[PDB]
Symmetry: T
């Protein structure tokens, strides 16, 4: 029947976790069609003088493949 | 001694991770007594036109059992 | 030497596990060349009134990269 | 707002994997409402004179909770 | 064929691992029928002035379900 | 009390999962005594022109050791 | 070449995940030098009358070691 | 240099964990030479009317292989 | 808020599992303050002529940090 | 902020581990831009008459995506 | 169809990783026939005054079972 | 009675895996006494113009504690 594909991305953001996630999805939408779900694999980040510099969320984005 | 039980729930929310966790805890409080701790197992979600449709957090809720 | 690539697909089917795997592989053949092997990562599915609605097999497909 | 609950069951059958899964779902449908999805956690079984005696599929059944 | 259900419990005890396990099983038999097997998932505990305060054993208890 | 041993085998087959499992158990029966249970660890396979060429199921076979 | 060390901390906060993480990092910078990155290992918490009492984020903090 | 081999065994005992472990080692000593170490993989068991019927410890036994 | 630290120790003992855990906690108490909880990660050991030479339990010890 | 993508490759070589890794990176450089980091997931290989025939290293290559 | 067996070995060497793997495989050749592949499970070692004393590679060796 | 402690380090080197491990052990020897063993947890690295820029090996170093 239907077949999906999953790509692994790493969204980053200085705002927070949800922001990093949306950042990855926003870019995914530019080149991938039929985005359906995502799964968080890792949550990490860089440290600056004020604490967290950047949040980095590693996630898998699942999307439906078309006919051909 | 004391004995606890753990149940696995998946709280959802279009707002955020904390909201999804709270949603699951809110519902848990209605039928389970002595809620003590939770452990997040998975974080996933669905995608819509604006990006994240709903955040889904799989978590285990531990509570103390009576008698 | 030789270098391979692995892509993650999710084949579905209402018939069974083998069918879901085949579905994923059939679509893979359309856009990928030199498909060599697959590894099943997860087996899950949706539930309907008759039980299993659709079986969903998450798998990795390995194929030889050209050049 | 929505909240789901997952329970772990072990379906068994002498027929095969799919049958063992259906067996667990069939029994689940008797006491649980709004069955949505299932995840296979382990596949094991017992051995008899003719090979596989009984297939045993440990799976999680997710279902939606009423507010 | 037969169907089983597994529940996750945490048995505790100041005496030891075996005691913690038994404590969990003892309570399990008061509300669950047809207990067949258990599986240890975690072993943790709290620390007191004399070392271990209480042992905590997270385990899954498997029991057969009645077709009703 | 009693003691068991577990060996890891990989059964293969062009027909399906159950068949690959059976193939491993069939061969295990020829040199091992008191076979009791099995656990599936991995499910993988090779790809051919028609899709799945061979299904490969890695499993652990548990058997009682004699004293 | 360079060598790094990782320490495991648990930051807590009644506000949220990002806050818990920052709390851990804030304390980390008082005794550790050259903090470079962090990795979330677990997310758990305690439950109170209003739901989440406190969020607990277990994380690893990586920092560069000084050759001395 | 040296090469070791690991076999997986399941020791059982009604006494307790340590007992099940020793049970597996005792039998291992009968047919395997140069036993060096063991690693516990799983701890499970059966349930009887008095609680735990049998403890079952799944472990790997490592031993040194000889010349030929 | 409060911040904890976790250290990983491997307590040993020729007596048993509980003893090995205690051995690690005893030593921990000498240089670490505010010990709160422990988590067992691994259970292994060495083998001698009488069977188990020494039990080794890898565990993490969590304690609250000051200021 | 920025977004990265990770692809899974398997580099192979008859000489060793580093060589297999390099082989994967060499090929990755031909079609992927902004390669930043890699992570080794698995190390396996084939066996021949002289021992190791080919070393196979499965790794993830992370690279920055352009906007 | 064909059935394979996997045994777990631990090769050691003071020279390096590849050497430890080869050591395990060389001894394997002495008593096992039809060695086909290996999978590295762990990489550990002992420490001496000069740093690494011996590298120890835990691996699984797959081979075709006869008949 | 004996108690060990494990610390997690990340050794780096542009030479190779073994070198990165030695780098971590070398630095470890400067502040830690009774280094006994090490376990490799991850192998990763950075990518440069020529392929691997720097190998990074995350490992745990076990050492014996003084009573
Ligand atoms: Cl791709
Ligand atoms: Cl329940
Ligand atoms: Cl430290
Ligand atoms: Cl054997
Ligand atoms: Na948040
Ligand atoms: Na004990």
């Amino acid at each position: 029947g239907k077949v999906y594909k999953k790509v692994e991305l790493v969204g980053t953001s200085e705002e927070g976790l949800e922001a990093a996630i949306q950042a990855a999805l926003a870019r995914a939408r530019k080149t991938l069609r039929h985005l359906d779900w995502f799964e968080v694999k890792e949550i990490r980040g860089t440290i600056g003088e004020a604490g967290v510099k950047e949040y980095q969320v590693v996630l898998e984005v699942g999307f439906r493949l078309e006919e051909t």
